[PDB]
Design an enzyme around this catalytic site. Sequence first.
Site, PDB file in Angstrom:
ATOM      1  N   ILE A  26       0.849  -1.184   0.000  1.00 16.38           N
ATOM      2  CA  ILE A  26       0.000   0.000   0.000  1.00 16.38           C
ATOM      3  C   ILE A  26       0.899   1.253   0.000  1.00 16.38           C
ATOM      4  O   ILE A  26       0.523   2.253  -0.583  1.00 16.38           O
ATOM      5  CB  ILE A  26      -0.900   0.042   1.271  1.00 16.38           C
ATOM      6  CG1 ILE A  26      -2.027  -0.966   1.205  1.00 16.38           C
ATOM      7  CG2 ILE A  26      -1.458   1.480   1.548  1.00 16.38           C
ATOM      8  CD1 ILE A  26      -2.806  -1.102   2.475  1.00 16.38           C
ATOM      9  N   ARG A  28       5.186   2.939   1.256  1.00 18.45           N
ATOM     10  CA  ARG A  28       6.532   2.754   1.784  1.00 18.45           C
ATOM     11  C   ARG A  28       6.982   4.044   2.420  1.00 18.45           C
ATOM     12  O   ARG A  28       6.833   5.105   1.829  1.00 18.45           O
ATOM     13  CB  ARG A  28       7.487   2.402   0.633  1.00 18.45           C
ATOM     14  N   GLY A  29       7.527   3.958   3.619  1.00 15.48           N
ATOM     15  CA  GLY A  29       8.040   5.121   4.332  1.00 15.48           C
ATOM     16  C   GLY A  29       9.368   4.812   4.992  1.00 15.48           C
ATOM     17  O   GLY A  29       9.900   3.709   4.842  1.00 15.48           O
ATOM     18  N   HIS A  30       9.925   5.775   5.733  1.00 16.48           N
ATOM     19  CA  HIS A  30      11.195   5.582   6.441  1.00 16.48           C
ATOM     20  C   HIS A  30      11.051   4.540   7.567  1.00 16.48           C
ATOM     21  O   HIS A  30      12.037   3.910   7.971  1.00 16.48           O
ATOM     22  CB  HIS A  30      11.675   6.927   7.020  1.00 16.48           C
ATOM     23  CG  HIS A  30      13.098   6.917   7.481  1.00 16.48           C
ATOM     24  ND1 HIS A  30      13.428   6.637   8.796  1.00 16.48           N
ATOM     25  CD2 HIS A  30      14.233   7.172   6.790  1.00 16.48           C
ATOM     26  CE1 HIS A  30      14.749   6.718   8.861  1.00 16.48           C
ATOM     27  NE2 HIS A  30      15.278   7.037   7.680  1.00 16.48           N
ATOM     28  N   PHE A  31       9.826   4.373   8.094  1.00 16.51           N
ATOM     29  CA  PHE A  31       9.550   3.414   9.156  1.00 16.51           C
ATOM     30  C   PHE A  31       9.570   1.957   8.667  1.00 16.51           C
ATOM     31  O   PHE A  31       9.795   1.063   9.472  1.00 16.51           O
ATOM     32  CB  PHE A  31       8.179   3.707   9.785  1.00 16.51           C
ATOM     33  CG  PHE A  31       7.051   3.701   8.776  1.00 16.51           C
ATOM     34  CD1 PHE A  31       6.406   2.522   8.433  1.00 16.51           C
ATOM     35  CD2 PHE A  31       6.643   4.868   8.160  1.00 16.51           C
ATOM     36  CE1 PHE A  31       5.402   2.516   7.477  1.00 16.51           C
ATOM     37  CE2 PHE A  31       5.613   4.858   7.231  1.00 16.51           C
ATOM     38  CZ  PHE A  31       4.989   3.689   6.907  1.00 16.51           C
ATOM     39  N   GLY A  32       9.284   1.737   7.383  1.00  6.17           N
ATOM     40  CA  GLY A  32       9.160   0.421   6.774  1.00  6.17           C
ATOM     41  C   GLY A  32       8.124   0.484   5.673  1.00  6.17           C
ATOM     42  O   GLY A  32       8.073   1.466   4.926  1.00  6.17           O
ATOM     43  N   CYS A  33       7.278  -0.538   5.571  1.00  2.00           N
ATOM     44  CA  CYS A  33       6.237  -0.621   4.557  1.00  2.00           C
ATOM     45  C   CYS A  33       4.861  -0.797   5.161  1.00  2.00           C
ATOM     46  O   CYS A  33       4.731  -1.165   6.332  1.00  2.00           O
ATOM     47  CB  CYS A  33       6.549  -1.750   3.581  1.00  2.00           C
ATOM     48  SG  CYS A  33       7.856  -1.347   2.406  1.00  2.00           S
ATOM     49  N   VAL A  34       3.842  -0.541   4.367  1.00  2.12           N
ATOM     50  CA  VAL A  34       2.447  -0.790   4.704  1.00  2.12           C
ATOM     51  C   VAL A  34       1.962  -1.808   3.639  1.00  2.12           C
ATOM     52  O   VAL A  34       2.170  -1.596   2.440  1.00  2.12           O
ATOM     53  CB  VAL A  34       1.541   0.436   4.729  1.00  2.12           C
ATOM     54  CG1 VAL A  34       0.123   0.043   5.180  1.00  2.12           C
ATOM     55  CG2 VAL A  34       2.124   1.548   5.616  1.00  2.12           C
ATOM     56  N   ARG A 150      -1.411  14.443   6.416  1.00  4.88           N
ATOM     57  CA  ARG A 150      -0.910  13.161   5.881  1.00  4.88           C
ATOM     58  C   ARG A 150      -1.163  11.992   6.844  1.00  4.88           C
ATOM     59  O   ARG A 150      -1.155  10.812   6.436  1.00  4.88           O
ATOM     60  CB  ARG A 150       0.608  13.252   5.584  1.00  4.88           C
ATOM     61  CG  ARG A 150       1.478  13.560   6.823  1.00  4.88           C
ATOM     62  CD  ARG A 150       2.970  13.622   6.528  1.00  4.88           C
ATOM     63  NE  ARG A 150       3.732  14.022   7.716  1.00  4.88           N
ATOM     64  CZ  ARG A 150       4.024  15.283   8.027  1.00  4.88           C
ATOM     65  NH1 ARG A 150       3.658  16.272   7.225  1.00  4.88           N
ATOM     66  NH2 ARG A 150       4.694  15.561   9.135  1.00  4.88           N
ATOM     67  N   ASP A 164      -1.154   7.447  12.419  1.00  4.21           N
ATOM     68  CA  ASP A 164       0.239   7.814  12.402  1.00  4.21           C
ATOM     69  C   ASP A 164       0.963   6.907  11.432  1.00  4.21           C
ATOM     70  O   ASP A 164       1.133   5.723  11.694  1.00  4.21           O
ATOM     71  CB  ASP A 164       0.841   7.728  13.817  1.00  4.21           C
ATOM     72  CG  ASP A 164       2.224   8.345  13.934  1.00  4.21           C
ATOM     73  OD1 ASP A 164       2.882   8.513  12.912  1.00  4.21           O
ATOM     74  OD2 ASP A 164       2.630   8.687  15.055  1.00  4.21           O
TER      75      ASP A 164
HETATM   76  C1  LIG Z   1       6.762   1.717  19.206  1.00  2.00           C
HETATM   77  C2  LIG Z   1       5.783   1.892  18.595  1.00  2.00           C
HETATM   78  C3  LIG Z   1       4.671   2.165  17.837  1.00  2.00           C
HETATM   79  N1  LIG Z   1       4.654   3.221  16.980  1.00  2.00           N
HETATM   80  N2  LIG Z   1       3.433   3.245  16.376  1.00  2.00           N
HETATM   81  C4  LIG Z   1       2.644   2.235  16.808  1.00  2.00           C
HETATM   82  C5  LIG Z   1       1.339   1.850  16.473  1.00  2.00           C
HETATM   83  C6  LIG Z   1       0.515   2.625  15.509  1.00  2.00           C
HETATM   84  C7  LIG Z   1      -0.778   2.957  15.836  1.00  2.00           C
HETATM   85  N3  LIG Z   1      -1.609   3.668  15.000  1.00  2.00           N
HETATM   86  C8  LIG Z   1      -2.993   4.042  15.396  1.00  2.00           C
HETATM   87  C9  LIG Z   1      -3.603   3.019  16.353  1.00  2.00           C
HETATM   88  C10 LIG Z   1      -2.990   5.466  15.956  1.00  2.00           C
HETATM   89  C11 LIG Z   1      -1.784   6.076  16.298  1.00  2.00           C
HETATM   90  C12 LIG Z   1      -1.753   7.373  16.806  1.00  2.00           C
HETATM   91  C13 LIG Z   1      -2.925   8.074  16.981  1.00  2.00           C
HETATM   92  C14 LIG Z   1      -4.129   7.484  16.649  1.00  2.00           C
HETATM   93  C15 LIG Z   1      -4.163   6.188  16.143  1.00  2.00           C
HETATM   94  C16 LIG Z   1      -1.169   4.127  13.777  1.00  2.00           C
HETATM   95  O1  LIG Z   1      -1.880   4.772  13.018  1.00  2.00           O
HETATM   96  N4  LIG Z   1       0.129   3.795  13.454  1.00  2.00           N
HETATM   97  C17 LIG Z   1       1.036   3.084  14.221  1.00  2.00           C
HETATM   98  O2  LIG Z   1       2.170   2.874  13.790  1.00  2.00           O
HETATM   99  C18 LIG Z   1       0.771   0.748  17.112  1.00  2.00           C
HETATM  100  C19 LIG Z   1       1.523   0.058  18.035  1.00  2.00           C
HETATM  101  F1  LIG Z   1       0.949  -1.015  18.634  1.00  2.00           F
HETATM  102  C20 LIG Z   1       2.812   0.391  18.381  1.00  2.00           C
HETATM  103  C21 LIG Z   1       3.389   1.505  17.759  1.00  2.00           C
END
Ligand SMILES: C#Cc1n[nH]c2c(-c3cn([C@@H](C)c4ccccc4)c(=O)[nH]c3=O)cc(F)cc12
Length: 284
Positions: A26, A28-34, A150, A164
Site C-alpha cells: 500500500i 513505503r516510508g522511512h519506518f518500513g512498509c504498509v 498526511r 500515524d
Molecule cells: C513503538 C511503537 C509504535 N509506533 N506506532 C505504533 C502503532 C501505531 C498505531 N496507529 C494508530 C492506532 C494510531 C496512532 C496514533 C494516533 C491514533 C491512532 C497508527 O496509526 N500507526 C502506528 O504505527 C501501534 C503500536 F501497537 C505500536 C506503535
Amino acid sequence: NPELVQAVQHVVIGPSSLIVHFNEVIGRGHFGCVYHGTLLDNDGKKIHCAVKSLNRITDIGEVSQFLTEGIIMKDFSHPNVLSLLGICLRSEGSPLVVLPYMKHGDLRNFIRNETHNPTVKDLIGFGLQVAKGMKYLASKKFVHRDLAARNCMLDEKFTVKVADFGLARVMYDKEYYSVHAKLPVKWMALESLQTQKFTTKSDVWSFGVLLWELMTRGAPPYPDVNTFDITVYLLQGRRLLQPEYCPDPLYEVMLKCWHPKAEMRPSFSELVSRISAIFSTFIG
Ligand SMILES: C#Cc1n[nH]c2c(-c3cn([C@@H](C)c4ccccc4)c(=O)[nH]c3=O)cc(F)cc12
C-alpha cells in the site's frame, strides 16, 4: 519483563487469524512498509486491514516500548481515531501494526487530488472531525507529536481517523530528536523546536497547521521558509498567512492555535465547540 508480556497478550494477532499480503504494498516510508492484510473472524468473515511494519524496532528496550504502545493504543475507541486491531511480534521479521483499512487513503492526498472537489464546508467538516479525535486522545493523555493532514485517514464513509504513518513512537521526548527521517519542523510548536518537548498544547499548534493544510487543499506550509529558519520566523511573530478560501473566524482559530504561550492556546474541547459553531454557518 514478564508482566509486560502478560499485559500485551490481548493485543497480539498471529497466523491463526491474519494473512499479510507481503506482495501487495500500500505504501513505503522511512519506518518500513504498509501492506494489504486480511483478518478472519471466528465465523470466517474477512476484514480488510493495513499492516504497517516498524523496521526500527529491534532491541529489547524498543520492543518493550512497542508492547507498551500497543497496550495503550488497543484501548482506543472513538469515531475519529484509527483503531489498533492488534500487533504481530513474529519470531522472524520486524514488528507489525494491524490497522483497519482506509478506503479513501490519507486526507492530504485526498484534498490535493485535482479530480476531487471538496467544498470549503467539507474541509471545515474534516477539521472538526480531527478536533474530535484529538479531544479524545488528549483526554487519554496521549500526545500525538506528528499531527498533520498526511496522518489523518478517510474510511469508506469519508469519516476522518487520526492515525500515524510516521516513525515508530517513542515514550520520551528526549528519544524523538535522536530517532529522527526528518522532524516535522513546519508542524511543530515553537517550544518543541527550542526545548525538544511535546504536550497536548504542542499538538494544538500542529492542529492549527493541519487546519491551514485543509483550507489550502494540501499546500505545503511555509514553502519559502527553510526548515532551519522556521524557529526564527516564528520568533519574529510571523505565521502562516490566511488561505484565500479560509473564513476569517477559522483563521482566527489558527492564530490562537499558534499562540507563543502554550498555556494560552485553546484546548481540543474548545476547538470542537468553536469549529462546530463555524461549520454551522456553512450551508450545504
Ligand atoms: C513503538 C511503537 C509504535 N509506533 N506506532 C505504533 C502503532 C501505531 C498505531 N496507529 C494508530 C492506532 C494510531 C496512532 C496514533 C494516533 C491514533 C491512532 C497508527 O496509526 N500507526 C502506528 O504505527 C501501534 C503500536 F501497537 C505500536 C506503535
